[PDB]
């Protein structure tokens, strides 16, 4: 981080029409990807133009699969000649505070993080299109943390499905849904690997003891109601636990010395716990107001100070 | 014993002042100055056949 | 395409040296009328 | 860039001398504001349900609170910086350890709730519970050591940190205090591993230092059971706790002119992340 803060420039051309220059005055805060943190870019380098691979515009989910390699920044002014961004990996202002802007469906809360999505949502694809420079400007959309792991849990679970509904969501009672589109096959299996390996890394020896006590949590259902709405209507180890019957194994190699308990949650922590980073990308942002409100609503800024 | 080193001196440049007017160049230009050009956006010149 | 404003014509700044048939090439310009002899638009 | 809380009217007199004790430690509160109410500050002022919240509900609420380190204590307002703005203009800001646990130069510093063993104010009827700045290398451990602990009800308690000796057990309520983050620890594994199980049903039965490795190498190269709507209910689930219990560290600690370890009771001089 640098004392004088660090600001890129997105370079505006030359022709551009007044029905194009106030179309990037409504720009304010909003999320824009560097390939690289150069000083100075030009639009044709962030515009989806250059997000294209060879030729094949991908779809929603490579769209996840591309911002991890990008570096994700925030407009704090636009001039007429250039535009002047942040970006989030390196540092924020002298301040630490850039002001966003709500594109989201849904409102915020004080202190929540943000991971941003693609536009998704039906209804909500709006991308700024200047017409005198023929780019298109797809805005990704900030969203709460817990909706991030639900919305990239949700495309991955449907890409599976095309391999051999899902798409309604529920987030504070307002009913929101999701663009239903075919799903490339190469992305998908990207994420695929990227499951398989966290969730088989996740299974130590001392695992064999957790999945024998399977029968006390279907008995300990029965009593605390902590335990009957935890596992679920529409969950696995419910009828997973009405059909096996489970027992540990007999002893283990030099087991007096190591913890086979201790082991396997040491190593969950770090490959399935850590699983919601290596799908969609990280947490920078939460929202921290100083003195507005316990909700920042939607079309409003709102402060940001950064977040592991 | 008598011994030593020795600098001979140590030699330099002059950067060449180049007026613009001093070129060849300078007929194909109009050459007069704003005070102020980013105060402005498109703008315009007339001529009539 | 701004229609541009006839009084400054009526005292130029600089006079031009060669008459050339001038809609041959147009896009050099942008607001380019063929004024067939003194005509509506011009008032 | 310093905030005030107030306290409010009518403190006795050994509750002056209490708030007097807590000179350099780790209070988290809503949102950074230049003035701020101490019923809004304490224990209290998350206790929100009906059951006052054990040590799952605390890590919860300290990801969505903004962690504040206490200066000076006024007998009017205790006066306090935030460590996510305030400490970005003011350098450096001292700390002091609950912990039974000494701090090392350079070490980032997390924080846990109170699980081993607490200043009351009767006159306001309030307690005020306070976090446990341990060194975050342990954090996976203690942590992980704790939650193996409830395993077992369904040898372990020998830690070793700087030459020294843990004991973790120094019995009745922690174990108690600890019942919500056993049972989804368990939840989220057994949820992990038959979903895991069902969508490649061979993963137990493959000869495992012979053909199972195959079975490794080729992933690393470049009625109804209602399976593919179950992810969602492990991925949320398990994408939940993966910020619970990171146990990410706000605090790292660099001395300069003074001891090269730091000792309970003593302040240990403390920044951000530049």
Redesign the interface.
Known sequence: ?LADGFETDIAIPSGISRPDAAALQRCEGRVVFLPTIRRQLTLADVAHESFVSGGVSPDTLGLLLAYRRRFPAVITRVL??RIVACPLDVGLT????VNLRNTSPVDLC????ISLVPPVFEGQATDVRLDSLDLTLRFPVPLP??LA??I???L??RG??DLND?NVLYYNGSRLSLLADVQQLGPVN?EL?SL??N??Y??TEG?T???T??P??FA?SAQDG??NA???M????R??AQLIHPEAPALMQDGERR?P??E???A??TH??????TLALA?VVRV????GAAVVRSGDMAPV??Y? | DVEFDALLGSYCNTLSLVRFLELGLSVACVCTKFPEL?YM?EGRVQFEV | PPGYRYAAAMVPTGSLLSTIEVASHRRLFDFFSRVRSDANSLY
């Open positions: 981080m007429p000649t002298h301040a630490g505070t004080n202190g929540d993080p943390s817990p792991r639900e990239v849990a949700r991955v679970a599976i499905r899902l990207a690997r398989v390996l969730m088989v996740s299974i695992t003891i957790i999945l006590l399977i006390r949590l300990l902590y335990v935890l596992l679920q529409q969950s696995v180890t009828e997973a913890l308990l201790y396997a949650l040491v969950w922590l399935a716990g850590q699983l919601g980073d947490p921290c107001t100083f003195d100070i950064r592991p | 980013a956006n």
